[PDB]
């Protein structure tokens, strides 16, 4: 008995928190074959949890230093049997309390092959100029 | 038979989409799957499901939608969904009406191949202003 809102709130809460405390563990939220498109800390495109881990690990200090504040959130069911979830978030990235850029991010979450959990199969995030 | 890239596909789709929006919004719905979900701009937001409801949205708001001027600043895409055959697009840019203010927007689409593979249909569409 869980709502799409319940799942997205909990996922984004946990994801963004992990981003602030330990980027080296962020890859755990992704599927094995996930794809990530991320502005560099000009975008990088990588595929697979291992490469995604290398990207977040190599940029660990910079990931932790840019704090994300969410301004909008939207989601919809998608994909096979409408069981996946599309999320779009927008907001602002701050460096020790100073606005650096806006962000736009989308995720796709795919339910796990066992049950209650979701994995990210797709993540696109762009930092755009204020 | 191929050599067709994800970029070619996405650039064609967006060109066709925004061109139809400019010329005849009453026919926009035909780009959507029958059970597509749209989360859009109140002419705060409107959520609608199904091609018939999507068509009532664009047709009722016909004068506003058609007089829009639009420029894309970023376009990102990845494969997703069943067998990696669907496409996630996220585009940002600017949007304005004949007279006055300039709005930044973020839009995401998911495109799924039609049953016989004639077209990529929109299953999901989300747009917000930032």
From Swiss-Prot, chain A:
Disulfide bond entries: none
Residue window of the full protein shown: 2 to 143 of 515
Origin superkingdom: Eukaryota
Domain NTF2: 7-127
Keywords: Phosphoprotein, RNA-binding, Ubl conjugation pathway
Protein name: UBP3-associated protein BRE5
GO cellular component, one term: cytosol
Function: Has a role in de-ubiquitination. In conjunction with UBP3, cleaves ubiquitin, leading to the subsequent mono-ubiquitination of sec23.
UniProt subunit comment: Heterotetramer with UBP3; contains two molecules of BRE5 and two molecules of UBP3. Forms a complex composed of CDC48, DOA1, deubiquitinase UBP3 and probably BRE5. Within the complex, interacts (via C-terminus) with CDC48; the interaction is direct and UBP3-independent.
Note: Present with 11700 molecules/cell in log phase SD medium.
UniProt-recorded Gene Ontology molecular function terms: identical protein binding; mRNA binding
């Amino acid at each position: 008995g869980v709502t799409v809102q319940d799942i997205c709130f909990a996922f984004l809460q946990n994801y963004y928190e992990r981003m602030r405390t330990d980027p080296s563990k962020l890859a755990y939220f992704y599927a094995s074959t996930a794809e990530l498109t991320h502005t560099n800390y000009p975008t990088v495109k990588v595929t697979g949890r291992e490469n995604i881990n290398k990207f977040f690990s190599r940029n660990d200090a910079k990931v932790r230093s840019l704090k994300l504040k969410l301004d909008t959130i939207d989601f919809q069911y998608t994909g096979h049997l409408h069981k996946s979830i599309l999320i779009m978030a927008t907001g602002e990235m701050f460096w020790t309390g100073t606005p650096v850029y806006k962000f736009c991010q989308t995720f796709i979450l795919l339910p796990s092959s066992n049950g209650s959990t979701f994995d990210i199969t797709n993540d696109i995030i762009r930092f755009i100029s204020n």
